[PDB]
Design a protein around this ligand. Structure first.
Ligand SMILES: *[C@@H]1O[C@H](CO)[C@@H](O[C@@H]2O[C@H](CO)[C@@H](O)[C@H](O)[C@H]2NC(C)=O)[C@H](O)[C@H]1NC(C)=O
Ligand SMILES: *[C@@H]1O[C@H](CO)[C@@H](O)[C@H](O)[C@H]1NC(C)=O
Ligand SMILES: *[C@@H]1O[C@H](CO)[C@@H](O)[C@H](O)[C@H]1NC(C)=O
Lengths: 107, 120, 335
């Protein structure tokens, strides 16, 4: 089973800043990765599929990159509505696994 | 559009068979992958299993394979969850998931979800 | 993308080729064929929808996935074919007639090829044999494969692969067995040297009681790939159908041009007709009576000749080539 080490666990930032969250896999998973945005009291919504591609409806300001084992998401021009929990999810091995969660909060 | 709604008992005794229900509205049951996802509070998401509609093929997590069985009901637009001999570690928030793509690990759709607490 | 048992590899033998052809369909009326191969066309290593690259099955012990472009793809039956479309397992090509079809990857000097027997003939539309479609003629309903790639002619069934064992996974040294995995990948072993034993170890580990290397079987637990229900592989212990992709290039009804023959010169005589005929290609002539007995006949005529047909009072109807059927009626002009 391919295990996950979510990066970073926590990060406080204000409105308009840029935060980078990394996604490191123990095995080469090519570029099949999907990221989620968890809103409290609600189901998480997909933001990035295929580790570089945008879901329709998702903001362009959200841009993810990476291949192989190292992956990044860049959150440029941070707002109030997207303080949430970040979760990158691979879809190669059965079953799929998750991270430990990255918390971002208003400074 | 596809809408999902979870409907299960919120408080079950340990060492008991857990049965949870997700109904599907707006689309047929036989042409999409149907998925259960758990989410323990203070932890993260974890895979449970999946079923295909018109085939009944099931793939489950190896750790929980011995205690998870998935059946579907085409007449009620229904697919169900059975979890035998629950423990205190099985207390989790439960999601049922569906996707616009016929089969994908990523799920476009998602029910609001139901909370299940295992305690004495 | 799995690899299959191709009956004709590059030199002479039945061998393993990862663009192995299972079947070829030639139901089109324009001569085009569609080809099933074991490789994925139009997708990267991750499977991204990108037209200019494809992927195939690697020839090494780690059994990973590599990439290649279509500039080194050759399709041939007797000469090189013309490529028109591709999705995944599927092809479509326009080819000259031949007794077999050949697919190849010309990856530098490594020209791995696969050839499967299939009788491809030059078929035609209508009642006139033709090689290339003329500019002028009748427009007739025909049936060809659609060049649009997003169509759906049907469905095929895929399942999870079974255990694909290796000898590079097992190591023999001084009369005992060893298991060496690639780093970072769990390998499920199976061996039998007395009691029946299982287990899953991701690291090099001694196994006891074994003297021969032909008694232990090791394979990586691979769930990433999806494989077609092919007769060349060992399937998994549960044979449940788990999913299905479309069969592209649906055979769509379209209008096609067909040539028109030369109009015959018709001469008259008593209770009979004589048609002077001219066709450089074989064409059909069908005559039938208009009474109790039809007396229907049909012939394929090459070159020029003259055919005599008796016509009664009830009459006769003759069809020459692709034209409108013409009904003729005799008289009582006895000499
Ligand atoms: C593949 O091998 C790795 C290495 O043994 C297994 O890793 C275990 O992962 C779990 C969850 O993080 C840890 O609690 C264990 O400590 C790890 N191994 C050990 C022995 O501690 C992984 O489970 C293996 N996957 C499969 C399918 O067997
Ligand atoms: C030539 O004559 C032969 C018969 O002897 C015939 O079969 C052939 O079609 C002819 N070729 C032409 C049309 O010149
Ligand atoms: C066709 O009919 C004409 C006139 O009766 C005759 O001269 C000729 O030999 C006949 N030819 C055939 C094909 O029998």
């Amino acid at each position: 089973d391919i295990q996950m080490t979510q990066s970073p666990s926590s990060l406080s930032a204000s409105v308009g800043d840029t935060v980078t969250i990394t996604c490191r896999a123990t095995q080469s998973i090519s570029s099949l990765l999907a990221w989620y945005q968890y809103k409290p009291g609600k189901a998480p919504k997909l933001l990035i599929y295929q580790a570089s591609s945008l879901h329709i409806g998702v903001p362009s300001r959200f841009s993810g990159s990476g291949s192989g084992t190292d992956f990044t998401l860049t959150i440029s021009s941070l707002q109030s509505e997207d303080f949430a929990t970040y979760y990158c999810q691979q879809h190669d091995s059965r079953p799929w696994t998750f991270g430990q969660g990255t918390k971002v909060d208003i400074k | 559009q596809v809408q999902l709604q979870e409907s299960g008992p919120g408080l079950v005794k340990p060492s008991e068979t857990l049965s949870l229900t997700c109904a599907v509205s707006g689309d047929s049951i036989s042409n999409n992958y149907w998925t259960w996802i758990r989410h323990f509070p203070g932890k993260g998401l974890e895979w449970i299993g999946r079923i295909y509609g018109d085939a009944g093929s099931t793939d489950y997590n190896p750790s929980l394979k011995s205690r998870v069985t998935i059946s579907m009901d085409l007449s009620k637009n229904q697919f169900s969850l059975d979890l035998t001999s629950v423990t205190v570690a099985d207390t989790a928030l439960y999601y049922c998931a569906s996707r616009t793509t016929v089969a994908d690990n990523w799920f476009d759709v998602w029910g609001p979800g139901v909370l299940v607490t295992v305690s004495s | 993308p799995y690899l299959g048992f191709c009956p004709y590899c590059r030199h002479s033998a039945p061998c393993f080729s990862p663009i192995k052809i299972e079947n070829v369909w030639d139901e089109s009326d324009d001569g085009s064929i569609r080809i099933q191969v074991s490789a994925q066309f139009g997708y990267n290593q991750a499977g991204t929808a990108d037209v200019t690259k494809f992927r195939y099955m690697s020839f090494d012990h780690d059994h990973d996935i590599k990439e290649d472009s279509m500039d080194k793809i050759a399709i041939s039956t007797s000469g090189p074919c013309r490529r028109l479309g591709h999705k995944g397992y599927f092809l479509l090509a326009q080819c000259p007639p031949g007794d077999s079809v050949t697919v190849s990857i010309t990856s530098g000097a490594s020209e791995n090829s696969c050839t499967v027997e299939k009788k491809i003939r030059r078929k035609f539309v209508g009642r006139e044999e033709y090689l290339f479609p003329p500019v002028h003629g009748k427009l007739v309903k025909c049936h060809v494969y659609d060049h649009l790639k997003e169509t759906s002619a049907g469905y095929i069934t895929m399942h999870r692969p079974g255990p694909h064992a290796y000898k590079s996974y097992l190591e023999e040294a001084s009369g005992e067995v060893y298991i060496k995995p690639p780093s970072g990948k769990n390998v499920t072993y199976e061996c039998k040297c007395g009691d029946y034993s299982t287990g899953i170890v991701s690291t090099r580990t001694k196994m006891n009681g074994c003297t021969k290397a032909k008694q232990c079987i090791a394979y990586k637990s691979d769930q990433t790939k999806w494989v077609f229900n092919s007769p060349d592989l060992i399937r998994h212990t549960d044979h449940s159908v788990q999913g299905k992709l479309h069969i592209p290039f649906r055979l769509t009804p379209t209008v096609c041009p067909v040539p028109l023959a030369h109009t015959p010169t018709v001469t008259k005589w008593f209770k009979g007709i004589t048609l002077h005929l001219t066709a450089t290609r074989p064409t059909l002539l069908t005559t039938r009576k208009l009474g109790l007995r039809a007396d229907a006949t049909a012939e394929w005529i090459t070159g020029t000749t003259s055919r005599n047909f008796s016509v009664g009072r009830e009459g006769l109807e003759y069809v020459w080539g692709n034209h409108e059927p013409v009904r003729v009626w005799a008289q009582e002009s006895a000499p």
